[PDB]
Amino acid sequence: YYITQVRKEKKGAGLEFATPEEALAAHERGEVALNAPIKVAGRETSVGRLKYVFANPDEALLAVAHGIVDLQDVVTVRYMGKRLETSPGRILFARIVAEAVEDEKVAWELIQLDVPQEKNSLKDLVYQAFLRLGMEKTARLLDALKYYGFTFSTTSGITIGIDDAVIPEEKKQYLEEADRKLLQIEQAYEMGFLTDRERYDQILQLWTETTEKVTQAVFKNFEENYPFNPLYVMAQSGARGNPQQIRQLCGLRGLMQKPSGETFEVPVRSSFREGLTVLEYFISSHGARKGGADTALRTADSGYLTRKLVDVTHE
């Protein structure tokens, strides 16, 4: 995923020119980035696609070796009779599949070049390779995918720090709004306009909505400001974690349920990066134990069910 994902710049991000000569000239002046989207004459391109046109993948990867361009830079390459506009990393991925199956024409039909390679795209590639090539060539492709994935994840620079759990600035705004609406709910309840149960339901709805907004704000920050953030990349690519776990690290823990099944009125408004309080940690332990007990008492049921199914259908 790391090599097949392309960079996005904001420096230029909009400037329109008349000729590519002007567009490149601004790039040397620092007014536009290599991968900032622009419009040269009528079409929307970038400096990299105009500046770097490679005759074939070997020349493109030679420039990467010399540090001219990165794997994530979008440039122009000539591959299989087509003047593609992709990054050297995606051209490298195409060669990886082509060499594993030893068929350049069939390999080009198996991959989606214009997307980052996530878990689903890599799963479709394996299935299609199995249909077209068989077990032997598919096992070779799986060995080649494993080798290059391991090699590129080591040198890519993936790491987790405390600052990688980026806290959206919108969380403070949302929590202040929830306090006002909650304070407004209490004001109406004091006035008798609603009962205890509807007050209880309205509080749960308020914090259920705020949790969703905080989750969206967390991920909107990643895809706009930190597209290569380790938590974003792991969840987006399918390597590790889901949006719910990322929210607890970066957003807010949320609502917790009592041992009886009820939810506490006060939610855990802190993430794991900030650190829970003693009372919040204790309240959160009610659900942790319940999940552990459910898992233990669920293995026996599933195992018993499988034995019933085997004994009914074994013949």
């Binding site: 068989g134 077990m135 032997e136 096992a139």
Partner: protein, 93 residues
């Protein structure tokens, strides 16, 4: 994966028939000391030893290679079992 596994699977109607054919051929090769092989001297499987290259001792490897060549016949009721063993003993004492 086994070499030519895709081709081997395509030679039989049921994948389990391939195992029976391979397993039976391997027993034939072992029982006659590999003297009944349909593999030419330059096709025989080899294993790299400290002394040097020697014939592969694995009979299941031999059967799979022989089956790929197409010089083996398999099926049901090809010949009576007793007569088959008698002839194979005579041809390869």
């Amino acid at each position: 994966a086994e070499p030519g596994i895709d081709k081997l699977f395509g030679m039989v109607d049921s994948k389990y028939r391939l195992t029976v054919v391979v397993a039976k051929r391997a027993q034939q090769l072992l029982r006659h000391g590999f003297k009944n092989t349909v593999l030419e001297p330059e096709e025989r499987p080899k294993m790299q030893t400290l002394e040097g290259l020697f014939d592969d001792p694995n009979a299941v490897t031999w059967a799979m290679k022989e089956l790929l060549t197409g010089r083996l016949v398999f099926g049901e009721n090809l010949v009576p079992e007793d007569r088959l063993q008698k002839e194979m003993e005579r041809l390869y004492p």
